[PDB]
Amino acid sequence: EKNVSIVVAASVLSSGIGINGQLPWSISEDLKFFSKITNNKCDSNKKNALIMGRKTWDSIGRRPLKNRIIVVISSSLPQDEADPNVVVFRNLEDSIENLMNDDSIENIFVCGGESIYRDALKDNFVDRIYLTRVALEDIEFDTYFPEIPETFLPVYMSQTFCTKNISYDFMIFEKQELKSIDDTVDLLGEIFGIRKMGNRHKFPKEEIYNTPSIRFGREHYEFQYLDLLSRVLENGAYRENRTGISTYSIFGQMMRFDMRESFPLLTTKKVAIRSIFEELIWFIKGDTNGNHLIEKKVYIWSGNGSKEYLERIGLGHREENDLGPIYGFQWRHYNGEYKTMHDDYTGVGVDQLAKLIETLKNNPKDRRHILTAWNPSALSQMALPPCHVLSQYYVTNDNCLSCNLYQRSCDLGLGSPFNIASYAILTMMLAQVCGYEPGELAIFIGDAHIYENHLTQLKEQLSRTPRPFPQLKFKRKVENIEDFKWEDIELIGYYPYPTIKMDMAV
Amino acid sequence: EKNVSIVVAASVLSSGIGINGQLPWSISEDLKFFSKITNNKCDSNKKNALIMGRKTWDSIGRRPLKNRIIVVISSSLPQDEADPNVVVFRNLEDSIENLMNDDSIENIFVCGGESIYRDALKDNFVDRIYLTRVALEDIEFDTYFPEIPETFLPVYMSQTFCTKNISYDFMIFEKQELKSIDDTVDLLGEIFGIRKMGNRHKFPKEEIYNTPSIRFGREHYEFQYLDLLSRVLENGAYRENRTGISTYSIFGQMMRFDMRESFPLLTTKKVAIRSIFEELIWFIKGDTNGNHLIEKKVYIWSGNGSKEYLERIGLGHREENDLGPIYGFQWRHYNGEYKTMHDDYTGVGVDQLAKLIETLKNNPKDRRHILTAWNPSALSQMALPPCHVLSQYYVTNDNCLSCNLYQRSCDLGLGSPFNIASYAILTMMLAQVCGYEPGELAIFIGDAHIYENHLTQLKEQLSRTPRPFPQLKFKRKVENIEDFKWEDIELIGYYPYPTIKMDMAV
Ligand SMILES: NC(=O)C1=CN([C@@H]2O[C@H](COP(=O)(O)OP(=O)(O)OC[C@H]3O[C@@H](n4cnc5c(N)ncnc54)[C@H](OP(=O)(O)O)[C@@H]3O)[C@@H](O)[C@H]2O)C=CC1
Ligand SMILES: NC(=O)C1=CN([C@@H]2O[C@H](COP(=O)(O)OP(=O)(O)OC[C@H]3O[C@@H](n4cnc5c(N)ncnc54)[C@H](OP(=O)(O)O)[C@@H]3O)[C@@H](O)[C@H]2O)C=CC1
Ligand SMILES: CN(Cc1cnc2nc(N)nc(N)c2n1)c1ccc(C(=O)N[C@@H](CCC(=O)O)C(=O)O)cc1
Ligand SMILES: CN(Cc1cnc2nc(N)nc(N)c2n1)c1ccc(C(=O)N[C@@H](CCC(=O)O)C(=O)O)cc1
Ligand SMILES: COc1ccc(CC(=O)O)c(NC(=O)c2ccc(Cc3c[nH]c4nc(N)[nH]c(=O)c34)cc2)c1
Ligand SMILES: COc1ccc(CC(=O)O)c(NC(=O)c2ccc(Cc3c[nH]c4nc(N)[nH]c(=O)c34)cc2)c1
Ligand SMILES: O=c1[nH]c(=O)n([C@H]2C[C@H](O)[C@@H](COP(=O)(O)O)O2)cc1F
Ligand SMILES: O=c1[nH]c(=O)n([C@H]2C[C@H](O)[C@@H](COP(=O)(O)O)O2)cc1F
C-alpha cells in the first residue's frame, strides 16, 4: 500500500494535453518538473514506477527514463523481459501490481494519455494529481484530460511562470477521505474582547474564502487581492462616507505581486485593460482634460467630472470635464499655478517624472526615487484628492525595478483592480526607458473598503478559482515614456472569467 | 498517562509570585485565565485535578474550586473524605495518582507555591508550563518561581495586555523530547532560481531568528520588528549608498503594533524615550533649529547638521545647525518660502497639523486624514529629505485612532526604533486632543536596510527573548498639542535589556 499520483500538463480551459501524437507546446521547465516529481523518493534502494499508455510510450521515443521503471499499457506489445526498466501489462488493473508486491517500488505515477487517465479515475486508483495548467486555448487538440471528479480538492496553486511568453501554473489536487496553542489563544480571545488585536483581525470564514481547500499553498499572487476581499467581508466596519453608498472598511493592508514571470491582471473577472492604459498614459502626458478620455471611449472619470458633481463640491466655475490639478499635473508640473485645462504648462512646476527617470538610470541605488501627488496647496482645486498618493521605486542588484505604492483609499470593487494593473504597466514603462526588467509590486492600503452595492458581485467573484496571470510585452522600444501607444501593448494568454458589472459611487 | 501542566504568574525579571501569604498584584484577567485554562477539558464526564501546596490552599480561603478537584500537599492536614472536591496527600509523588488510576481525571495542573513548583520540576513530572509574566519588579517578594530548566522551550508568547497600568504577557513552555506541498515548492525552487518570487523572500535561518522555538505563537508584536531584522539578514542585498557605510537592503516590508493595551517601546534594547519625545515635540512646534535639541542634550541631529556635512551637500551658506525646511516645517508651514531658522513663519504656508486635528474631530470617518512631508520644491534646501514621508490617520467606529506611516528609507539599527515610538506617541497625542483612544500602528517601509557596522550589535539584540511592552500614559489633559512636556509623560513597567551602542552614518 503506497501512493499513486497523476502527473499531467493540460490547457487552462479545455484541458487539452496532446495533438497529432505529440505535445501542443514546448515548455522546458515543465519537463524538468515531470523529472523531479517522478524521481522524488525516500529510499535510495527503491525506484518509482511510471504507468503510461502505448501511444505515450511511442511519443517519448520508446526509450527508458533514468532511475525509473516505465510501465506500458498495451494489448499488442510483447511482454519483453530483456529490459528491466520497461515492463508491459495488458490492462491498467493488472498493472497495479507495484502495490501487491515488488517492495522495491516506493511510489507510483500515472503519466499516460487520455485513456489511461480516464480509466485510473474511473476505477478510483488515484490519490494525488499534479496538474500543470498551460495558458493556450486557441489551438487544436485531439487528446484531453478528463474532468477532475468531485472527490478531489485543490491544496496548492503556485505562482504564474513564463516560458516563451506562455503562462503556466502548478497545482496539487488531493482526494478527501499542537492544539494547546490554539486553545490558549481562543481562551484569551474569550477573556479579552476586542482588546486583543487578534479579534480585530479575525480569519475569514470558509463561506467568504476563495477556494477554501487551499490552506497552505496560496502561492498564486491573485490571492493577495482575493484574500483582502475576504478580510474585509470578515472584519469590515459599516461606515458612511461622502457618497450616499456606505462601505465596509478596515485600515492598514498590503498586497504583493510578481512582475518578472507574469503580469498581475486579475483572472477572476474580465478587467478593461485598454481603459487602464489610456488612463495611465493620460497621467504620463501631464493631461487633466477629462474629455480626452471620453473621446477615446473611456468613461471612468465621467462621474467625478460632471457639471452636477463639480458644482456640488464647489467648483461650478469650472468647465464641464476640467478635473483640475490631479494625477499627471503633480507628476509633471508640481506646485504649478493651475488656471484651466487649456493653458500651456510646459516649463512651470517641478517635473517629478522627468527627474525620476533621470535619477533611476544615473543613480540606481539611490533611496529617493519617489513620485508623489499629495499637494496640500492644490487639494481645494482638485475634483478628487489623490487616492494612489505616493509611489517609490527601487533598483535591485540584478537590474530589476520594483515599485511600492501607498493608497489612502481603495475601492476594492472597481479602483483596486485598476490600480494594480496601472502601476504594474507604469513600472514596466519606467523599466524599459531606464534599461531594466520588471521586479515586484507592493501596494500598501489605508482605508480598504467595499461598497455595499458590490456585495453580491464580489461574492460571485470569490466563487471563481483563479487562473494563471497573463503576460504583457511591449512591441517596440520607445525613446520617450510619452510615446507609448495602445497598439504597442501585447496581452498574451489572458483567459479571464466573464466581466462583472459594478456601479461607481460618485 | 495524561498531561501535567504548571500554571503560574511570576514577575518578569525576578520571578516573584507571592508576598506575605498573598499575591503581589491584583489582575482580574489573569484569574479568569487560571479558571479557563484549568477547566479546559475534552470529556464532560471527567474533571481536572489542581495540585497545590498547603499555604496556597490557605491563601484561597480553603474553599473548593467549581467543576475541579483540588489536591492539597500537606503533612498535617487530616485526609478528610467528607469533601469529594478536596483531597490531601502527604507528598507530591504520592499525589501523582491521577495517572496511576482515577480515570475520571483528564488533566493535571500544578498550581502550588515555590515548594510544589520546585519539587515538580526536580522530579521531572511537568510536561507544559503556562506562565503569566507580570511587569512589576521594584516591590518586595518572599516566594519565587524556580528557574525553568533547559529541557523546556517556549512555543507561544501573547501580545502585551494592560490592567490598572500593569503590563503582562502569556507564554507556553513545552518539554522537548503535508510533506507533499513542501516538497513540490522545493522542487519548483530548484528548477526556477530567483525567477520564483519565494526564493527572493527566503524564510530566515534558525541562527538569525529570534527565539526560534516559538514557531506558531509569535503573537507579541515586538516580533514584527525582530523578524524584520531576520528577513533582512537572510535576503538583504549588499549595496552602497551616499554614506561610506554599505547596507544590506530589501524592499517592501511592513510592521503592525497595538496601542490599546501597551506602548510599542522595544524591550530587547534600552531605547532613549526622552530623546524620541523631544524630537517629536520639536516637529510639532514647527521648529527647524537644530540647536534647540542640542540645548536639551539631544544629539540625534548633530551629524546631519554639522558645518562639514552642510558644506559637503552644498549648503555652506547655512548657519551651523540650521537644518532647513524639514519635518515640522512641512507640517506647519507647507509650501512656505524658507529663509533661515530665525525668521517668523506664523501664518505662511499650509498648516497640515492644525487642519488634521480640525478634520479628525469634525469629520472622523473622512478618508483624507493625511500628513505629508515630501515637498519636491523644497528638497534641495533640506539637510536631509524626509524618511518617514507620509502618514494617514483613521477613526474606528469605537472611537479609536489608528495610524499608517510610509517610510522610504529605514535604518533598522537606529531610526526604526525611534520611528515606531515617535509616531506611537504622536498618535496618542492626536487621540487626546481629538477625544479618542489609541488604536493600531502600521508602518510600511520602502528601503529596509541594516548598516554593516551594526551586524554584531543587531545579532546580539536577536539573542534576547522579548519582554512585555510597557505602558505610556499622560499625566494631564492638554488644550493644545503644542503644550506637551516631557514631565507629562509617565512610562510604567519598562524593564528592557541593556542598551546597545551603534554609530550613525552621516
Ligand atoms: N500533457 C501531458 O501531460 C501528456 C500528454 N500526452 C499526449 O497524449 C497523446 C497521446 O495519448 P493518447 O492518444 O490518449 O494514447 P494513450 O497514451 O492513452 O495510449 C493508448 C494506448 O494504450 C493502450 N490502452 C489504453 N487503454 C487500454 C485498455 N483499457 N486495455 C488495454 N490497452 C489499453 C492501447 O494500446 P494498444 O493499442 O497497444 O492496445 C492504447 O492504444 C500524445 O499527444 C501525447 O503527447 C501523453 C502523456 C502526457
Ligand atoms: N503567582 C502564582 O501563580 C501563585 C502564587 N502563590 C503564592 O505563593 C505564596 C505561598 O506559597 P509557598 O510559600 O511556597 O507555600 P506552598 O504553597 O508551596 O505550600 C507549602 C506547604 O505545602 C506542604 N509541602 C510542601 N512541600 C512538601 C513536601 N515535600 N512534603 C510534604 N508537604 C509539603 C507543606 O505543608 P505542611 O506544613 O502542612 O506540611 C508546606 O508548608 C503565596 O503568597 C501565594 O499567594 C501561590 C500559588 C500560585
Ligand atoms: C511526451 N511526454 C509525456 C509528458 C509530457 N509532459 C508532461 N508534463 C506534465 N506536467 N506531466 C506529464 N505527465 C507529462 N507527460 C514526455 C516527454 C519527455 C519526457 C522526458 O524526457 N522526461 C525526462 C526529463 C527531461 C528533461 O529534464 O527536460 C525525465 O528525466 O523524466 C517525459 C515524458
Ligand atoms: C491565590 N491563588 C493562586 C494563584 C493566583 N494566580 C495565579 N495566576 C496564574 N497565572 N497561575 C496560577 N497558578 C495562579 N495561582 C488563587 C486565587 C484565586 C483563584 C480563583 O478564585 N479561581 C477561580 C476564578 C476566579 C475568577 O473567575 O476570577 C476559578 O474558577 O478557578 C485561584 C487561585
Ligand atoms: C469591474 O468591471 C468593470 C467594468 C467596466 C468599468 C468601466 C470601464 O472600464 O470602462 C470598470 N471600472 C470603472 O467603472 C472605474 C471607474 C473609476 C475608476 C477610478 C475612479 C475615479 N473616481 C472614483 N471614485 C470611486 N468611488 N471609485 C473609483 O474607482 C474611482 C476606476 C474604475 C470596471
Ligand atoms: C540604539 O541605541 C541608541 C542609543 C543612543 C542614541 C542617541 C540618543 O538617543 O541620544 C540612539 N539614536 C541615534 O543615534 C539616532 C540618531 C539619528 C536618528 C534620526 C536620523 C537622522 N538622520 C539619520 N541618518 C541616519 N543614517 N540614521 C538615522 O537614524 C538618522 C535617530 C536615532 C540609539
Ligand atoms: O484610483 C483610484 N482608486 C480608488 O480606490 N478610488 C476610490 C476610493 C474611494 O472609494 C473613492 C474616493 O475616495 P474618497 O471618497 O476618500 O476621496 O475613489 C479612486 C481612484 F481614482
Ligand atoms: O527617521 C529616520 N529614520 C531613518 O530610518 N533614517 C535613516 C534612513 C537612512 O539610513 C538615512 C537617510 O536615508 P537616505 O540616505 O536615503 O536619505 O536616515 C533617518 C531618519 F531621520
Side-chain angles (χ1 to χ4, degrees), chain A residues 1-31 33-45 47-92 94-99 102-146 148-175 178-296 298-306 309 313-336 338 340-476 478-484 486-500 502-506, chain B residues 1-31 33-45 47-92 94-99 102-146 148-175 178-296 298-306 309 313-336 338 340-476 478-484 486-500 502-506:
Chain A
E1 176 63 26
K2 64 210 66 177
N3 201 263
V4 172
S5 302
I6 279 185
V7 193
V8 60
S11 61
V12 51
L13 301 183
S14 53
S15 299
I17 66 172
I19 173 65
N20 293 324
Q22 64 179 18
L23 299 173
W25 51 69
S26 178
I27 302 176
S28 175
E29 295 85 345
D30 174 62
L31 292 183
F33 180 76
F34 175 86
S35 179
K36 301 205 171 186
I37 202 65
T38 54
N39 277 313
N40 190 28
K41 60 181 186 176
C42 188
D43 195 329
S44 64
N45 298 332
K47 293 169 172 287
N48 288 333
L50 311 189
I51 303 179
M52 64 180 63
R54 190 218 77 206
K55 297 192 179 182
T56 302
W57 173 242
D58 294 351
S59 62
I60 65 175
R62 293 198 178 187
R63 278 187 163 81
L65 292 173
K66 185 86 142 55
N67 303 126
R68 286 150 295 178
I69 296 180
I70 296 184
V71 180
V72 182
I73 304 305
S74 179
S75 61
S76 60
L77 268 181
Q79 296 177 348
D80 192 356
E81 300 179 359
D83 200 339
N85 307 280
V86 178
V87 67
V88 182
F89 285 85
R90 298 306 172 188
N91 60 88
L92 180 65
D94 290 9
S95 69
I96 314 290
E97 181 193 352
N98 317 113
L99 288 184
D102 214 330
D103 297 322
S104 57
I105 274 69
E106 175 174 318
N107 302 118
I108 301 170
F109 295 86
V110 174
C111 324
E114 176 171 353
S115 63
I116 305 301
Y117 286 148
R118 195 170 299 275
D119 290 332
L121 298 170
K122 174 181 178 298
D123 297 335
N124 206 270
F125 293 150
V126 183
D127 299 325
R128 211 186 323 276
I129 294 181
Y130 296 93
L131 172 63
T132 302
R133 303 189 301 178
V134 184
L136 289 174
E137 275 301 330
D138 294 306
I139 64 181
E140 185 181 1
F141 302 105
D142 57 18
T143 303
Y144 302 85
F145 182 72
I148 302 181
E150 299 178 356
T151 59
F152 287 86
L153 283 182
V155 302
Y156 173 78
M157 177 185 300
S158 71
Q159 68 172 87
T160 305
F161 295 100
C162 182
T163 291
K164 308 174 186 178
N165 296 329
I166 303 179
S167 299
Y168 52 95
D169 265 339
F170 295 93
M171 294 188 61
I172 304 181
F173 287 87
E174 293 271 16
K175 206 198 163 175
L178 199 55
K179 191 176 60 61
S180 60
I181 300 182
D182 294 8
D183 289 353
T184 298
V185 175
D186 290 333
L187 294 181
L188 291 177
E190 296 175 5
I191 301 171
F192 306 92
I194 61 180
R195 295 169 54 193
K196 174 170 160 49
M197 187 168 163
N199 279 325
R200 304 172 241 153
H201 302 265
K202 294 183 179 178
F203 194 81
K205 299 166 300 184
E206 176 174 330
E207 307 85 54
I208 56 177
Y209 205 50
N210 180 280
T211 316
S213 51
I214 302 181
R215 303 180 60 190
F216 313 98
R218 314 186 131 256
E219 181 178 316
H220 183 17
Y221 287 97
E222 184 163 358
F223 288 130
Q224 300 278 319
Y225 168 82
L226 295 178
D227 296 359
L228 178 53
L229 295 179
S230 300
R231 231 136 58 237
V232 170
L233 291 177
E234 180 70 24
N235 308 284
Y238 191 65
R239 310 168 92 244
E240 61 277 2
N241 53 34
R242 58 172 185 84
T243 67
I245 300 93
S246 299
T247 64
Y248 296 85
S249 168
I250 65 179
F251 191 68
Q253 294 289 316
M254 83 162 179
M255 297 178 296
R256 313 187 79 104
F257 298 96
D258 178 57
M259 297 183 303
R260 297 195 181 194
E261 297 285 326
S262 66
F263 176 78
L265 189 64
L266 300 184
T267 59
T268 53
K269 175 186 66 177
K270 185 176 177 179
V271 186
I273 180 62
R274 190 190 111 264
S275 301
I276 295 180
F277 165 82
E278 218 63 52
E279 182 198 36
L280 176 57
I281 194 61
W282 183 65
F283 294 158
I284 297 177
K285 282 182 166 61
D287 197 357
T288 62
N289 192 324
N291 296 287
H292 297 170
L293 295 178
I294 308 181
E295 292 166 9
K296 298 166 177 293
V298 175
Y299 318 98
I300 63 177
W301 284 97
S302 297
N304 306 94
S306 62
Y309 172 82
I313 66 175
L315 298 174
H317 66 277
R318 194 71 57 81
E319 199 181 321
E320 173 66 22
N321 284 295
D322 191 340
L323 297 177
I326 51 168
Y327 321 106
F329 187 91
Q330 310 301 326
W331 291 14
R332 311 305 305 274
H333 319 287
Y334 191 90
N335 276 333
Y338 189 86
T340 60
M341 64 178 182
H342 301 287
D343 296 286
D344 182 25
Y345 298 98
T346 51
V348 67
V350 179
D351 198 333
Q352 292 187 83
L353 186 56
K355 304 185 69 175
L356 171 64
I357 298 178
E358 193 71 14
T359 315
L360 277 178
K361 46 189 178 182
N362 293 333
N363 189 11
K365 298 189 186 308
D366 184 50
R367 298 180 289 208
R368 308 181 176 110
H369 309 295
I370 291 189
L371 171 65
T372 181
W374 192 261
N375 195 329
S377 300
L379 296 177
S380 55
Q381 297 179 319
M382 300 183 186
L384 193 63
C387 294
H388 44 110
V389 170
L390 180 135
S391 56
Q392 187 184 9
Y393 302 90
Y394 181 86
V395 180
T396 68
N397 284 17
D398 55 329
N399 299 285
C400 288
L401 188 66
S402 295
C403 167
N404 282 347
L405 166 67
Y406 186 83
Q407 186 175 11
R408 63 159 182 88
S409 185
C410 186
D411 185 355
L412 290 173
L414 297 181
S416 191
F418 273 50
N419 293 125
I420 299 171
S422 187
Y423 276 86
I425 299 178
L426 174 59
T427 311
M428 291 182 175
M429 292 180 173
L430 294 172
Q432 176 180 111
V433 176
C434 301
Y436 304 117
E437 300 297 318
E440 299 179 4
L441 175 62
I443 299 177
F444 308 114
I445 299 177
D447 192 320
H449 52 79
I450 290 179
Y451 285 88
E452 58 180 350
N453 52 6
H454 298 169
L455 292 177
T456 299
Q457 294 85 323
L458 292 184
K459 289 179 181 183
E460 165 66 28
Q461 188 176 353
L462 283 176
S463 65
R464 304 170 173 183
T465 298
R467 292 163 179 169
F469 279 147
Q471 300 296 331
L472 185 139
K473 303 304 176 183
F474 295 143
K475 293 182 181 176
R476 67 180 179 93
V478 306
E479 60 181 10
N480 205 273
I481 192 179
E482 312 174 20
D483 303 335
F484 276 106
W486 172 238
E487 299 75 11
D488 299 330
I489 290 190
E490 190 173 1
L491 188 64
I492 308 172
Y494 186 51
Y495 304 104
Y497 288 85
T499 168
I500 305 178
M502 284 179 250
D503 301 332
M504 184 201 62
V506 180
Chain B
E1 176 63 26
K2 64 210 66 177
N3 201 263
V4 172
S5 302
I6 279 185
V7 193
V8 60
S11 61
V12 51
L13 301 183
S14 53
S15 299
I17 66 172
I19 173 65
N20 293 324
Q22 64 179 18
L23 299 173
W25 51 69
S26 178
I27 302 176
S28 175
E29 295 85 345
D30 174 62
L31 292 183
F33 180 76
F34 175 86
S35 179
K36 301 205 171 186
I37 202 65
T38 54
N39 277 313
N40 190 28
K41 60 181 186 176
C42 188
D43 195 329
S44 64
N45 298 332
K47 293 169 172 287
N48 288 333
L50 311 189
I51 303 179
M52 64 180 63
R54 190 218 77 206
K55 297 192 179 182
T56 302
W57 173 242
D58 294 351
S59 62
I60 65 175
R62 293 198 178 187
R63 278 187 163 81
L65 292 173
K66 185 86 142 55
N67 303 126
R68 286 150 295 178
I69 296 180
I70 296 184
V71 180
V72 182
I73 304 305
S74 179
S75 61
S76 60
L77 268 181
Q79 296 177 348
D80 192 356
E81 300 179 359
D83 200 339
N85 307 280
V86 178
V87 67
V88 182
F89 285 85
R90 298 306 172 188
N91 60 88
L92 180 65
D94 290 9
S95 69
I96 314 290
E97 181 193 352
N98 317 113
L99 288 184
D102 214 330
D103 297 322
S104 57
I105 274 69
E106 175 174 318
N107 302 118
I108 301 170
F109 295 86
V110 174
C111 324
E114 176 171 353
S115 63
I116 305 301
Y117 286 148
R118 195 170 299 275
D119 290 332
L121 298 170
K122 174 181 178 298
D123 297 335
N124 206 270
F125 293 150
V126 183
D127 299 325
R128 211 186 323 276
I129 294 181
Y130 296 93
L131 172 63
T132 302
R133 303 189 301 178
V134 184
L136 289 174
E137 275 301 330
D138 294 306
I139 64 181
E140 185 181 1
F141 302 105
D142 57 18
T143 303
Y144 302 85
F145 182 72
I148 302 181
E150 299 178 356
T151 59
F152 287 86
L153 283 182
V155 302
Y156 173 78
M157 177 185 300
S158 71
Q159 68 172 87
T160 305
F161 295 100
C162 182
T163 291
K164 308 174 186 178
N165 296 329
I166 303 179
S167 299
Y168 52 95
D169 265 339
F170 295 93
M171 294 188 61
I172 304 181
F173 287 87
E174 293 271 16
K175 206 198 163 175
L178 199 55
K179 191 176 60 61
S180 60
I181 300 182
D182 294 8
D183 289 353
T184 298
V185 175
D186 290 333
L187 294 181
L188 291 177
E190 296 175 5
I191 301 171
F192 306 92
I194 61 180
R195 295 169 54 193
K196 174 170 160 49
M197 187 168 163
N199 279 325
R200 304 172 241 153
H201 302 265
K202 294 183 179 178
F203 194 81
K205 299 166 300 184
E206 176 174 330
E207 307 85 54
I208 56 177
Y209 205 50
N210 180 280
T211 316
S213 51
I214 302 181
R215 303 180 60 190
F216 313 98
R218 314 186 131 256
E219 181 178 316
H220 183 17
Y221 287 97
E222 184 163 358
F223 288 130
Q224 300 278 319
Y225 168 82
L226 295 178
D227 296 359
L228 178 53
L229 295 179
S230 300
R231 231 136 58 237
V232 170
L233 291 177
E234 180 70 24
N235 308 284
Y238 191 65
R239 310 168 92 244
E240 61 277 2
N241 53 34
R242 58 172 185 84
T243 67
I245 300 93
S246 299
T247 64
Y248 296 85
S249 168
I250 65 179
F251 191 68
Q253 294 289 316
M254 83 162 179
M255 297 178 296
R256 313 187 79 104
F257 298 96
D258 178 57
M259 297 183 303
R260 297 195 181 194
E261 297 285 326
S262 66
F263 176 78
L265 189 64
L266 300 184
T267 59
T268 53
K269 175 186 66 177
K270 185 176 177 179
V271 186
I273 180 62
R274 190 190 111 264
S275 301
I276 295 180
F277 165 82
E278 218 63 52
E279 182 198 36
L280 176 57
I281 194 61
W282 183 65
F283 294 158
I284 297 177
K285 282 182 166 61
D287 197 357
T288 62
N289 192 324
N291 296 287
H292 297 170
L293 295 178
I294 308 181
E295 292 166 9
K296 298 166 177 293
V298 175
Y299 318 98
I300 63 177
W301 284 97
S302 297
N304 306 94
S306 62
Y309 172 82
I313 66 175
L315 298 174
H317 66 277
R318 194 71 57 81
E319 199 181 321
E320 173 66 22
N321 284 295
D322 191 340
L323 297 177
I326 51 168
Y327 321 106
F329 187 91
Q330 310 301 326
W331 291 14
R332 311 305 305 274
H333 319 287
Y334 191 90
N335 276 333
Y338 189 86
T340 60
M341 64 178 182
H342 301 287
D343 296 286
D344 182 25
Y345 298 98
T346 51
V348 67
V350 179
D351 198 333
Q352 292 187 83
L353 186 56
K355 304 185 69 175
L356 171 64
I357 298 178
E358 193 71 14
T359 315
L360 277 178
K361 46 189 178 182
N362 293 333
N363 189 11
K365 298 189 186 308
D366 184 50
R367 298 180 289 208
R368 308 181 176 110
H369 309 295
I370 291 189
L371 171 65
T372 181
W374 192 261
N375 195 329
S377 300
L379 296 177
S380 55
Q381 297 179 319
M382 300 183 186
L384 193 63
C387 294
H388 44 110
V389 170
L390 180 135
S391 56
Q392 187 184 9
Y393 302 90
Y394 181 86
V395 180
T396 68
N397 284 17
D398 55 329
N399 299 285
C400 288
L401 188 66
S402 295
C403 167
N404 282 347
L405 166 67
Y406 186 83
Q407 186 175 11
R408 63 159 182 88
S409 185
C410 186
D411 185 356
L412 290 173
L414 297 181
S416 191
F418 273 50
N419 293 125
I420 299 171
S422 187
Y423 276 86
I425 299 178
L426 174 59
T427 311
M428 291 182 175
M429 292 180 173
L430 294 172
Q432 176 180 111
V433 176
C434 301
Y436 304 117
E437 300 297 318
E440 299 179 4
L441 175 62
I443 299 177
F444 308 114
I445 299 177
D447 192 320
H449 52 79
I450 290 179
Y451 285 88
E452 58 180 350
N453 52 6
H454 298 169
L455 292 177
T456 299
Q457 294 85 323
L458 292 184
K459 289 179 181 183
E460 165 66 28
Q461 188 176 353
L462 283 176
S463 65
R464 304 170 173 183
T465 298
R467 292 163 179 169
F469 279 147
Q471 300 296 331
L472 185 139
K473 303 304 176 183
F474 295 143
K475 293 182 181 176
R476 67 180 179 93
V478 306
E479 60 181 10
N480 205 273
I481 192 179
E482 312 174 20
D483 303 335
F484 276 106
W486 172 238
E487 299 75 11
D488 299 330
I489 290 190
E490 190 173 1
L491 188 64
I492 308 172
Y494 186 51
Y495 304 104
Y497 288 85
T499 168
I500 305 178
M502 284 179 250
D503 301 332
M504 184 201 62
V506 180

